[PDB]
Amino acid sequence: TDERVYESIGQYGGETVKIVRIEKARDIPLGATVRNEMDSVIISRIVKGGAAEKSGLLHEGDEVLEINGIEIRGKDVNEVFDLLSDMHGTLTFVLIPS
């Protein structure tokens, strides 16, 4: 009757941003296949036994925002491949998990 109030409609708890570091050897792939979903770059698979799988910080579903201070979101996967091929040592990944 007279005034009925229904609070919190469309509540959301937000997203998590993950900042992880993974070792990469010169010309040895991390072992994670990537695909482009719209502008963003998404990890589609984690190769069995690769540097990404052993570390446990890279997962099938994550969005790659950045790698070593380089904007990955909004780049073609062929460009991410080239950027990654010339990388070694501690790589810092900025991600948005699934």
């Binding site: 991390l30 296949t33 190769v47 996967v77 062929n78 491949f81």
Partner: peptide, 5 residues
């Protein structure tokens, strides 16, 4: 067609 990386 998903690059290894």
């Amino acid at each position: 067609p998903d690059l290894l990386v």
